[PDB]
Amino acid sequence: KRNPDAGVATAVQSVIQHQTFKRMLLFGLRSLADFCSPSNQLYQENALDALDRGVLSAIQTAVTTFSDDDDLMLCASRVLWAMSVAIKEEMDPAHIARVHSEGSPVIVAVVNSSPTDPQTIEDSMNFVDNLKRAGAPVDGASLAGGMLSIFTKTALDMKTAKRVTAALAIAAETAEGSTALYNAGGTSVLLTYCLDQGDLSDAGVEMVEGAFDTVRYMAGYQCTDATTLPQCIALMDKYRGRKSASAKGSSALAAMIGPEQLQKCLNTLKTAEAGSAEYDEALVTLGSMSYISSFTDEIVRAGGVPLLIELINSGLPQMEGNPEKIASMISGAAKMLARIASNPVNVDAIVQAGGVATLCTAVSYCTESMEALGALCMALVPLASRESLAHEIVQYQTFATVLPILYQNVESPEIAALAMELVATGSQHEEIQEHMLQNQAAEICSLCCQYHTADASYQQHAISALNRLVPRLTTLHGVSEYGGIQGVIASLNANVNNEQVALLAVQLLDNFSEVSDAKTYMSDGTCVDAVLAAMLEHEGNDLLISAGVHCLARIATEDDCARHLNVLDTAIQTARGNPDGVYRVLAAISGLSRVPSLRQIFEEKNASDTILAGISSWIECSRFEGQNRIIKAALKTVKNMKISGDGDLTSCFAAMCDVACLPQVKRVVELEEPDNNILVADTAAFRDLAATMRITGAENLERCIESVLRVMRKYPDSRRAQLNCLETLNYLAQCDGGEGVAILSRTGGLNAVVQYLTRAPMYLDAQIAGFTVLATSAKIDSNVGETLRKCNCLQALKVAMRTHAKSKELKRTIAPLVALLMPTDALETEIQELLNECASACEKNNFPHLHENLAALNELLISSEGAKIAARLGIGAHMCKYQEYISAHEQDALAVTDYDILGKDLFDATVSECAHAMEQVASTRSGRNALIKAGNVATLISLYESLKAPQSQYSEEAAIHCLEALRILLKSDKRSAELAFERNFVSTLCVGIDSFPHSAPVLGATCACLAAMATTPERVQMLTAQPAFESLLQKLVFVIQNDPSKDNKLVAMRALQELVEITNDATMANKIAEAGAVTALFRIIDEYGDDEQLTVQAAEVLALLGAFEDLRRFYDNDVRFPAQVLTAALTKQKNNETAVVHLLDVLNKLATSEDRAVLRELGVMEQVADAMRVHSESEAVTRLGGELFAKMGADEQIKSLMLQIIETVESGAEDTAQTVDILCGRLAVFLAAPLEDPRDALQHTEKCLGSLVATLQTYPGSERLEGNVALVCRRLCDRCFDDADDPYGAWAVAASGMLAQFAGMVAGETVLANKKFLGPAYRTFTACCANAYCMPTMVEVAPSFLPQTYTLLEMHKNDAETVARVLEFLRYFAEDPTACGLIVQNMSGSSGDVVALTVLLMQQHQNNDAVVCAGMEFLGALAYTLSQAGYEPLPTLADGSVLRDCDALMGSNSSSARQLAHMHMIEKMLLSKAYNDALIQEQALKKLTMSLKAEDDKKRFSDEERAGLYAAMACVLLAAGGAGLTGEMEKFNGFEVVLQAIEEFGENPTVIKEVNRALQGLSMADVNMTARTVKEAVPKLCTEATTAIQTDAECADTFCDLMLQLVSQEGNGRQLLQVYGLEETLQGVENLAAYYGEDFGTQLSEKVAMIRQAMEDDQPREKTCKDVYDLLNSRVQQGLSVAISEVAILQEEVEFLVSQMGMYNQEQLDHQTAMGADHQYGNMAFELLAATSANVKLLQANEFSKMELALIKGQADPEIVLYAVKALTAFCKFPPAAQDTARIQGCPALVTEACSKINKSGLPNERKEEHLCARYFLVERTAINRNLYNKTPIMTELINSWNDYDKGAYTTTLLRFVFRAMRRVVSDAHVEELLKANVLQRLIGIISDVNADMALLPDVLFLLGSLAVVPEIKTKIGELNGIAACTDLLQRALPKPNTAPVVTNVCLAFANICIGHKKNTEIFSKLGGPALNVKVLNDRGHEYDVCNAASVLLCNLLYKNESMKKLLGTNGAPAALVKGLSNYDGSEEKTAIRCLES
Ligand SMILES: [K+]
């Protein structure tokens, strides 16, 4: 744990002192607050520090003594909050108690100060929450009075209010709390605030939610006041349109008014006299109770609806006489009828009582009584929702009367709203639309847009009315003349800051612009400017931007660009006084730059440079109002216009970094929030610039990267600006196809990223973001793995592992980095190190050590491969042991201050580490299956039971997660699941939830663990029948129904969701529904339909439950209740694609085809159609929507609308083009419905199309028509995009002539600016490519518009949808050989050839899979089709540049769909056989394997998704084999990928199918791929994939095809026949052929027959050991490898050698027998295999050293032993071989025995020598230590062989072997015999002998020097005159030829004899030795072996010898060494380099 800031003790000291000195106190507390602020990385540690130093006892003294100072309060609550945080985390009881005793009263004082400060409140509210979570809640009643007093302060924020009201409610929930509020000013204090200040924002509603809950609880305790009900009613009225607040208002009201008063009220109205006090008071009371929805059903039950309708019926006759008394009655009664009309049952009753005719007739009497008219409109809205009642309401002339009333300006905005809502509700029915415009009053709505221009809030019904009517309008004239556009423009301006409301207005203006003559009425500039401003305000809203751009492309003009550009200069200068002026111009330059036909005008004026200079002026000056807004607007402006352009972005990117580094920026940001300020916005801006990849060039990238580092360097504590910079670095690294990675390294940015991560260990988003940069840089270039290691990246990610242990996102990020930096080869030894240390700690009683090493152990285990090491070395058995000990020794708790954690904190930590270890282990099949086999599912359960958690500690929550995330993994295996139930763990888990309240992670993991036991239907039923699981299910439902907290609702609902997604069982769904979930979830969508998050989560669960359960049955089979809820929420969430998808999904599951009439009655049709229109590019919306429309008029409406189009274009009305447009538009919605009878539905599809072709040819340029006709054709093409036989689709489009029409339209460039036509049009093009019957005419048509398709792409490069549609068309088009040719020859232009453009596009939409996948698939198809048609390859593909660019688009977290498309691209490139050079150069295959490797580390995809990746990889390797790149696959572990696929997917037929075809193609490509398939892959197929080949027809048939390829080559049948499991596999195939037993089964049978016959004919087994040798020898001769690792065909040859030899070794062998000489050849064969270091571990596995030693010892024939000696002698050349050889018991004595036998034998001296050399050679290599051969008589045998030589008959070669072995065995133990045999004297004698054999002297000199290793021999050498004999020899030989090895070896002898020896160094000096050394250097210094040894002598003479240092300084040695240095001139030969070194 970290240390606190030292200055905290000086701050605490300052406030302890100066408690009284107020200004000094404020300094100290202000200082202590900043130490306790989260900006400090040590805020928790500092706060704990201030606690321990005793500051609260001073702070409490201060808040009391100075209760009036708010500044104290802000600082005090900050310190206290930070404590509570660190308190909750530490879970030290000592502290939690203290902070609650000494600390709680501090905050109680802050609360009783009526704080108004958002931070003071927020810190205080968060204090009590954390204290409660810590087990020390602050009494809510002690805080209730002060919190309530917060509301007498008028200017309180809504965000602060909501937090406080939520607390009051919880406080009031008790008797003590309600009482405190009651006596501290009652409900009026709160409710008065809600009324006088409350608003209708999301937070104002959430606030009033809590206020109503507060009143409700006080009502339960009789703490309400006579003012409460009235104020509650008036708040109900205020929040009428928001059901979340209304529902909690009626709940509160229900608690003030019992059910007893309802019945008395109604019975009083039935009996009491008319006009009496009791009647009047009863009717008033009934008004109040009409606000209670739980009473509204009681009113209807007791005939109250007729009573209210009678009041109106009987009142209208009386209106003439008393108009005002009657209007009031009507108002009151009609409002009650409006509130009664909630349920569909309630609306039924109103309708049964003649409500419609009553209300409508009353409207006809109240045309001059506005209040009553509004109440009547309010009662008709819910009735007009039904189509049939709205028809009745038209019949009665209501709309025809309310419209002229609005047309004359209803003054009250309240009445006007209710009246627009009614006309809007009615307009949502298609048949009432035609009435409300086509009959009359189309423009009456338009003129009303102009009246309450700014009122629109819930009153957006003026927009919606024209939004449902403009599609029908055939002209904008009326809407313009009446001022409709002016009113909507004027509306958007006012409401421009409300996002939702302005998206609606921009959509309405977009629809206006589609009208045919709309350019003539909206081209004055006022419409443009209102849209541009809106687009700049809401760039985050894709729907607003997209609608705005459609509109501008139609109406915006050049003059719009000129009139804003002309004022740019002036507007920038006058921005201080007139900031709006420059804002408007910026909005126009930004938005109009998105219009393709207008972009260039702003760059031809270099407006970007001007705006950038203007930003600097606005910063380098005095701060003025609007300065922030203006700078942020200009930053967004310059970003948008550069992105929309196509120039390089370096200059602008640098200018934005420079702007951020201006000295005044710090000042400007002081006054803002840290999240939103100009610095954060500037970094976000130049990040988006970098994301485009339009920064090219080493110079430029360096500039841009330096600039980013400057920003990071200059603002160290702007943590949102730090993030944006890290992201920017990620992008810049990818620029130039990854070459930005090199720039990022050599500028130091890689290390800067590491440095920042080390600085900010607490910031999780920064860890992920920073490691992403590093992972991106590694994946692109693994050469930066070295740099990251030297930057200490490993320690940094080690720290983030431990800090954010529960972050799954932080780990999929760092996973590749650990593998790269982890010691790749030191693991197997280091894991077994900690494995044994942990076990040892358990053997003792050392509980600390277990933790310490389990902690370190986990760090190692993270390595994916390292996790497989631990599993392989028996960690599971280890783990079961650790648990046995941990759970037993809990009294070890008392560690007694001997470790970092003590007490119970230490027990849970060990449990946590033990559990975490098994968690990493269970990553892949290797680990998870090892733990299961060990019984670890039992050890985990035992571990979790050891977490009894009597008192929560700060490692226990994490201990549970690890424990439960484990069993999620392990229990998913069927056998282990039943053990769980056996242990009664379901109950132990459920109690585990209630043990740890407030922990959403435990709840989630406990539920995922519960479902993991219910893998099958039997266990699902076991689970849901458990009582504890029943009580859990109900307490989750309870939380969804009563907990106000939105977050707890989302958590509960998520828990339920997973239970149904995992188990996926009709019994889970059934039990969840019956627990109350269906009604409770629909209630969420009914009350919280305005909240996207709650509505989406609720819908998600209901759709899951609705797939098994008939949802309507929970509403008594009346589907209208839930359907209305779904439709209501659907309309509120219209513009949230995600919410629309899930609402339509519950609707489509709730309803059936037998609901056609119920669904039409509710207008569901138009609501669904409206959605499909807005989200027209959402695949999900169009699917669900169509499926719903199949329930509401399948086939019928389609047939009728088509015929109607023919009737129209035949007559020839003046307005046909306009008329059919609205027909086509209606049709496209239906053409999305699945058609069960395509024949009938699409009868007239070819003529209908032919009639549209005519309509288009006579009415060109009708933009809207052109668009809707494209949409229908896409819907026709989409429904049979794959069935090339269907005639009612893409075929029809071509037959009828449309296909040629569309092509002409695009060829004429008339449409290029119309994106609503180009998208669908190019989708239908794509369809006519897919259908092979349409292709010939597509080819016949395309050349006329392919160049336009290019220019089209450059235009719309910024539109992802248009780009994706065009690139997709090119993908399919490129399949035809003529097409792909036309593409390359016609699509070339300003952006390069078609390939360059495609890259540019993907780079711009790098975040968009649809564009990227379409682009890669396109390049793939194009490259391949071109090669097969004879065309020439694509230069930039053959260049390797596109591969680098495409690799850059592949980030470490790119989706699976993008990985597949990238693999398909590479596959197609390989199949074309045209790009091998580039594919090898850029290492495509290696990178693909790496990526696939990473996805098994991360383990983020689903097993089905990885199935596709491996299946896809199998196909890539298949193409590689065909391409001739098997050499490439072996550089990396290519083949191993197929083996991995077999092991993990052996049960997946679709993987093994591709694996078989891959192995077949690899084999027939290469002989060594054939071998590895036989020896490695087929054994896996016949065992790990045997059931798949057996059960799946395609695996069986492809396996037979592969076997037939393998057996077709001699020798393979023999080896396959011996493959384990092949017979079981072949037989089951036959079994399979019997089942199908048709032409396929007969064919499969013949294949097995051929396979068996081939293996029988190829069962020779014809080979001996001499064969394996003659073969190996031929290779070694020819120069080939004999490494089995690298030459797979030698695998069999070695298996045979081990077997034949192993069997020869059973007997004694005569070398002159067939098997003896063959035993010789086998050992000569091994000897060649031993010459290679790779074979050492193969031979080591087969006991090579052990065999040979047995032969040498056992075999009595010396000629058999000879060749065993040699074979072992070569194996021992390599140290690790000699290590094992010489280490096995007896080897030294045995090898020496072999030596002895030959000295005592009586052989010819000829062979006696051969045997001695070889066996003494073995002695040399085996003598790894000098003390190894001590106990054996090796010295005796060496001396006897020497003595035999002195008698003669041996050559000098033997003596050299005697000497070589002697220096290895010479030791203190043989010293006595060395002196007896006078070895020294003999060697001295040979040295002195002037006739000595020159071939023997070098070894003599060498042995003599080596013998000096023994301290006693060293001295004897001097006493025996060895040094003088050596100096004499050196003098002798120096001038002679052929003496270089003597001079060399005599100098080394000198050095070894004197190095640290005072006696011999003085002998050597007196002989003139030092001068001689220098003479060997002056002479013969140019000889490198000589010069090297001479220099080695100098060093040894100098070592620890000052006098030699002085002597050789004046001896002339320095000048001699200088000459040795100068002899060099360039040689890098190994010899000249060792010389130069010495
Ligand atoms: K009361």
Ligand SMILES: [K+]
């Ligand atoms: K308006």
